[PDB]
Symmetry: D2
């Protein structure tokens, strides 16, 4: 029975079981465009609630990745239709950090947004009533935010990692600080 | 650049790339509990829309599976919280085929509901505005609904396939009539 | 502070406070196209959860009405765009009861669907984990399903009324039975 | 046949028809907690789309209100359940204007957040695909964001108005810059 929840992108350029060094059925999996945890998405949140409360999964992983079309279409003007609405949550993140990204060479922005987005989604995840509740009642649970680089097939931990609400705040804020200030 | 969209279940052992002879790269994947296509689900409908309108994917496959925790949780009268609201859609489906399902041995009922489900999710998929308009404007698009078993593999009753709204009805209705023959 | 939740149509052809013989602020109000309670609509369900669990509202009213455009567009072919997706829940209800409605004169079908829909939405409402939970813990709560006739300005109770899950089943099933079998 | 769409809050005393000189009949109304237009909310976006594309409504008004239970529940650290997830969107907004709000006397903070909110919901409304395409294709459409008070009535700082994506930026940004002047 599964011990992990993988929240990944529908691009699914990796096999989650390879990257996690797991076999299938250990992994409970949700996937959407640009691996989002939206506060009021019933679909993702159901997944999380069932995993956390019913299955007692101890580890949730948001894995983002490079050369993601959601990330690219988020940065692009183009009216693509309904998917724009879903990607507007990422555009909001794009402008939230517009100073960092402006300072950036246009060609390194997608890589950077991919990262920022993973951090932000782990932050959304750790603020859900589900996860906070699990923590308050002593349930063991850890959130993780990874990025797969499609161009060299490597994972990178993004230093975003929470086992409580205080630890969420500490590593989120520190992650954004590095991303914002470091070269 | 991907050529297929796979709608699967969050439980299912066996990811799309293992079940298929397709790499990761050619598969665009959505997964949720009990592999649903709910009419008003922004999450899944955004995957479908992006797949069809933008990536120009020409085949969508809804894959259900036997021994599925969603299907089983749908059937139980358990207060599991938020997830029950998601699964109420599967319980509507159960109630809609209650007569058929009531006829079966209780041990055969989960396998039936799993197959009925794929059939209903392909019927929902195929009535979305996104898919009808694709067809309306002449874009090639095939919907498929399959059920996977760990032991037997893919059940050679297959089921649903649609290349239009008209083939959608025929295929849906026959699949239900066929599953009713016991 | 409010003692009722009104779930009504965005057509809002009535003033809810007139119909309920209430003043504003007694009424907590949600409105959408064709007064739906969809199982996985986060928007409506939030409204209900906040009303039931935080505000301790004792009465939820789903009020439907005649000459509703949601009901009409549900019955119509026409691809209107995104609203079709929302109205597909009503089309499903339209075909669920296609034998009743077929037996009907084409001009009385909209009136009938309006009614069926109110009954079905009270049924969805009473199956939500929120409302069922409220009941299991002894909370006092009653669901009601009304229809306003715009052409003569009258309410009609639809005999759909639940104060538990057993009473939900009894009046729902009886409501459909009358609608199905009676002239 | 309606001519206006009103997006209001489920709390607010005073329905649209009382606040306005419009009958019921001319108003199409959506109400949710803290009068939100969330990018991915099928419920509200279906009202907007039907209003704009089908009913051809030419004015949308988001009306917020002072002494609003959503705004207040957003600010509290209370575990109220599902509703907190809905309100996390308001808390993002709080965090986004934290510096401004941190400057104010705590007793003035709820009124500010209420006004900031309407400004952000009009900004979301105006970036939906439905509204941009309406404008793109030349259809006349005006977005308005007002805040109501039980005592003072409508606050004559008004705020946002958009008849295009360009007027949307100007109006949004100025409204925020203006509310920052203390
Ligand atoms: Zn991706
Ligand atoms: Zn499953
Ligand atoms: Zn109506
Ligand atoms: Zn309010």
């Amino acid at each position: 029975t599964p011990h992990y929840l993988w929240i990944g992108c529908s691009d699914s350029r990796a096999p989650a079981e390879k990257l996690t060094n797991l076999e299938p059925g250990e992994l409970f999996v949700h996937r959407n465009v640009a691996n989002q945890v939206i506060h009021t998405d019933f679909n993702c949140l159901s997944v999380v609630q069932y995993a956390v409360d019913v299955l007692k999964i101890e580890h949730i992983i948001i894995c983002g990745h490079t050369n993601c079309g959601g990330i690219h279409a988020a940065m692009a003007d183009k009216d693509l239709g309904l998917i724009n609405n879903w990607l507007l949550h990422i555009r909001d993140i794009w402008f939230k950090h517009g100073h960092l990204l402006g300072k950036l060479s246009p060609e390194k922005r997608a890589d950077m947004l991919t990262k920022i987005n993973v951090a932000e989604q782990v932050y959304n995840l750790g603020r859900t009533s589900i996860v906070k509740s699990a923590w308050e009642r002593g349930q063991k649970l850890s959130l993780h935010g990874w990025v797969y680089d499609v161009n060299d097939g490597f994972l990178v931990d993004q230093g975003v990692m929470a086992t409580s609400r205080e630890t969420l705040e500490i590593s989120y804020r520190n992650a954004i600080a590095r991303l914002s200030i470091l070269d």
